[PDB]
């Protein structure tokens, strides 16, 4: 130990400044710590988990507190369409007098920030109405954040620490997470909806003071246990219903109308209560599949052992795969992140098309913000999923214990996997760029008729199957003589068909040749990023250039200049490479989303449809066009309320380019520079009275790529965010 | 110029170059005035605390103010886009 970082003796004996740097970036890599055991590993993680939950609870508690104390909300509830939600108050002594004037918006008393996360629509939909509601909610989360720390501390104590085999009790945890964590939680959420949320949308306020001697339904729980549940869908809210009031209010608490509430343009509250109630069943019954202490259930191991196709085309199938996953926390994290990354994108693609919060669709900046938010989160999560996959292969993978099972066969034919991913990327790349450039030349030579505009009829055919009238086609749900139509006839379909064919909402938007090209760009982005990541994973343990890439670990600088040169040959380094491509991919996705939507909100889908087929159009009619109000945030003539976004816009450019230094220039140059400065300090009078305690050295080879990538990423995210918010909110 | 194991210090240029070694040029009493009045700040630790707590609250104290910028002031707020 002796000094920081004392989870690693060998790194504390570093006489340079590298000990501090590396002491921070390895603080959570518990397995690399000194005297680590499997016992301390699971205990440290378990404790960190409570710490994380504590921060989450505390974080949301802050938002609630500040919205209540510095935000209107109550003013917003009366006029959702015509009140800007307030994030919080601005207190900055650097503010000049103009900035204080320009920023005091939303009917506040001083300069404030306008929220674009959409918590206002969420809490209004949820049932929250006044500030008092928000405070008690903030108190409750502050409380939950305390008992998180309290529980984290408790299981670090010797008489409450759980054994490793307790953590490896998979079937018990799954039986409880499915049944309790997913099911009961969802069940009880539908409870909040029919008690507070739904009656709140009908003018009656149901809080803790009066939720006992007040019925959610006239027949009141009678029909549920009777079996005639249909009574709860007997009288839904009217089509002329107004949210928060009794005008048009029904009595139903569980429906399946489909489509949107006309006023709020959001999903019916009675559709969502029903949704979670139905969900909770498949989850409650689902969490009784695996075996515990009652003599019934499944052995997850025994299932995997039993799934070997005869004729051995998958070898030994999934045998031994139970222990391979249950012993390796990285395999579990990889599976967790991949799954979580997919439903993170699923959330993004569903919340813009099928809004669940009242009056959230009208707020275009919030809708743009939230979509871009999750698609980058999902993107980052996806690369991490493909990072611990490699880590698993290096640290936990046991070749003999996975002999000839599906996992081993992956490595066995890794060249085939990688080469085809390379072919798919090359195919998509050559033609998507090819078609874009061809069209740009046609526009250049002033002959747009010569363009190659391929109609996306496959996807148009899908939309027709959903019931979209455009394109014709006479597909299912688009045809009067369709068994699928007459089956759902007058259930969810009238609401659905009405919504899918409304021209305002983002429910299955019309797509054309311009949509065709960007999607292949997207396809290109996905295939390449995966190609990089899985080539990294499958080569983590070695290659022809470096047969023993294991023994060296996940992250190492290289293997020297011999054998041709081996820079960026570690599995950590292709992660590093893949992040760039994932940033490029999500960038294409959010460019696509935001341009399609601003033209829609502007009533000018023509501009997108005619300019998205050639790349000059993207530069001129999307980026150059919408940058107008942004870059005029401050001017030689004045400053606006968009000045902060203009400043951040450059800030992003600065951080981004600053990262280019760490990525382009490498270490040997800076090491030789610093040692000349080491000379200077010692030979300068009055200055050599002061001596450094840590020897100044250049950042390491890997550290450089990390620092560079962080800048590149921070710049990336901060630049687009400055543009996304300003161009949108400047126009709305 | 030289090289003796006997005297490494001198061998490796450990010289107090521009050192004075001269007697104090400061007039006495003046020194004694400064030696008795600056004495409390010479204890360390306590100086660290005096500067944090002192510097912290002294800073807080200038919380109070006027011609800083505490005045959105009588200026009709704009709407100013779709409105709000």
């Amino acid at each position: 130990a002796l000094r920081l970082p004392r989870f690693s003796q060998g790194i504390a004996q570093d006489p340079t400044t590298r000990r501090i740097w590396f002491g921070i970036a390895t603080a959570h890599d518990f397995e690399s710590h000194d005297d680590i055991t499997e016992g301390r590993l699971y205990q440290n993680i378990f404790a960190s988990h409570f710490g994380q939950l504590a921060i989450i609870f505390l974080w949301t508690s802050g938002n609630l507190f500040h919205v209540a104390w510095q935000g209107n909300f109550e003013a917003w509830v009366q006029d959702p369409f015509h009140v800007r939600p307030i994030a919080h108050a601005i207190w900055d002594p650097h503010f000049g007098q103009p900035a204080v004037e320009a920023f005091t918006r939303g009917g506040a008393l001083g300069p404030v920030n306008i929220a674009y996360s959409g918590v206002y629509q969420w809490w209004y939909t949820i049932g929250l109405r006044t500030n008092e509601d928000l405070y008690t909610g903030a108190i409750f989360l502050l409380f939950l954040s305390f008992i998180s720390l309290l529980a984290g501390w408790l299981h670090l104590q010797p008489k409450w620490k759980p054994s490793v085999s307790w953590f490896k009790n998979a079937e018990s945890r799954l039986n409880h997470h499915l049944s309790g964590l997913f099911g009961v939680s969802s069940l009880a959420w539908a409870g909040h909806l029919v008690h507070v949320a739904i009656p709140g949308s009908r003018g009656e306020y149901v809080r803790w003071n009066n939720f006992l001697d007040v019925l959610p339904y006239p027949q009141g729980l009678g029909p549920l246990l009777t079996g005639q549940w249909n009574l709860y869908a007997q009288n839904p809210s009217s089509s002329n219903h107004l949210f928060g009031t009794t005008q048009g209010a029904g009595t139903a608490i569980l429906t399946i109308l489909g489509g949107f509430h006309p006023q709020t343009q959001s999903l019916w509250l009675t559709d969502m209560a029903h949704h979670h109630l139905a969900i909770a069943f498949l989850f409650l019954i689902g969490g009784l599949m695996y075996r515990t202490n009652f003599g019934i259930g499944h052995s997850i191991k025994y299932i995997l052992e039993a799934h070997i196709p005869p004729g051995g085309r998958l070898g030994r199938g999934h045998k031994g795969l139970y222990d391979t996953i249950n012993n390796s926390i990285h395999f579990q994290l990889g599976l967790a992140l991949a799954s979580l990354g997919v439903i993170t994108s699923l959330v993004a693609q569903h919340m813009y098309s099928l809004p669940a919060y009242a009056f959230i669709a009208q707020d275009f900046t919030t809708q743009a913000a939230l979509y871009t938010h999750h698609q980058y989160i999902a993107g980052f999560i996806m690369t991490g999923a493909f990072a611990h996959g490699p880590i698993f292969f290096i640290r936990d993978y046991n070749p003999e214990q996975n002999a000839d099972n599906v996992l081993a066969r992956m490595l066995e034919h890794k060249e085939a996997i990688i080469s085809h991913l390379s072919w798919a990327s090359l195919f998509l790349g050559f033609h998507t760029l090819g078609l874009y450039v061809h069209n740009d030349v046609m526009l250049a030579f002033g002959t747009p008729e010569k363009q190659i505009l391929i109609e996306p009829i496959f996807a148009q055919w899908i939309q027709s199957a959903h019931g979209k009238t455009s394109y014709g086609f006479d597909v299912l749900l688009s045809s009067t003589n369709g068994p699928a139509l007459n089956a759902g006839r007058n259930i969810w379909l009238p609401g659905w068909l009405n919504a899918i064919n409304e021209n305002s909402n983002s429910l299955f938007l019309t797509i054309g040749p311009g949509d065709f090209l960007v999607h292949h760009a997207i396809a290109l982005g996905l295939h390449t990023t995966t190609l990089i990541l899985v080539k990294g994973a499958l080569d983590a343990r070695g290659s022809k250039l470096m047969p023993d890439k294991k023994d060296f670990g996940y992250s190492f600088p290289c293997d020297g200049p011999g054998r041709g040169g081996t820079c960026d040959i570690s599995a950590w380094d292709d992660f590093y490479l893949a992040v760039f491509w994932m940033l490029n991919t999500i960038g294409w996705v959010t460019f696509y989303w935001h341009w399609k939507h601003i033209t829609l909100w502007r009533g000018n889908v023509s501009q997108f449809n005619e300019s998205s087929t050639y790349l000059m159009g993207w530069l001129r009619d999307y980026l150059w066009l919408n940058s107008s109000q942004l870059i005029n945030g401050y001017t030689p003539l004045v400053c606006n309320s968009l000045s902060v976004w203009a400043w951040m816009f450059l800030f992003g450019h600065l951080v981004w380019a600053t990262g280019f230094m760490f990525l382009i220039s490498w270490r040997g140059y800076w090491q030789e520079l610093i040692e000349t400065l080491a000379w200077a300090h010692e030979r300068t009078p009055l200055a050599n009275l002061i001596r450094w305690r840590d020897k100044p050295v250049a950042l390491s080879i890997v550290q450089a790529r990390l620092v560079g990538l962080v800048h590149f990423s921070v710049g990336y995210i901060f630049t687009y965010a400055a543009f996304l918010i300003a161009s949108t909110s400047g126009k709305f | 110029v030289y090289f003796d194991l006997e005297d490494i210090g001198n061998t490796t240029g450990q010289w107090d170059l521009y050192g004075s070694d001269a007697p104090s040029p400061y007039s006495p009493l003046q020194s004694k005035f400064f030696e008795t009045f600056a004495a409390p700040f010479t204890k360390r630790g306590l100086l660290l605390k005096f500067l944090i707590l002192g510097g912290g609250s002294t800073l807080a104290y200038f919380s109070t103010t006027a011609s800083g910028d505490i005045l959105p002031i009588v200026k009709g707020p704009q709407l100013p886009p779709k409105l709000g």
Binding site: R3, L4, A89, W91 | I52, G56, A60, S63, I70
Partner: peptide, 29 residues
């Protein structure tokens, strides 16, 4: 005016934090 928690978070906490970290980091048990 509670908005005078800003300097505390804004400056005081950071200074204390930095000083402390600096000391812990240079410590030689």
């Amino acid at each position: 005016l509670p908005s005078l928690f800003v300097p505390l978070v804004g400056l005081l906490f950071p200074a204390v934090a930095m000083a402390s970290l600096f000391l812990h980091v240079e410590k030689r048990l």
